[PDB]
Point group: C4
């Protein structure tokens, strides 16, 4: 399916945002 | 191709989980 | 949809570059 | 295009591998 695609994209992108948050934490803990 | 597209989407997803896990461990080491 | 698929692929890509940059800076802070 | 898709997937995945390498460095620098 083509939406199914787009679906998975949306999820992948979601993970990326979280990773970006997780990196913001780690940069702060590094002073 | 769509199967391949579908396989690579999962692969991307499983790397993301791996990455989020690596980063999770670093965040807590730095703790 | 294909345009949207195409837009989200780029978005994913630009986050990846951002992430690789964050991580690049942490690797060198730790240096 | 559907290959164009798959194409971008391949690139995204490539970035993920590198990110994984970059994280392996950073975990080593963290002892």
């Amino acid at each position: 399916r083509m939406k199914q695609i787009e679906d998975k994209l949306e999820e992948i992108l979601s993970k990326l945002y979280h990773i970006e948050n997780e990196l913001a934490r780690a940069k702060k803990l590094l002073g």
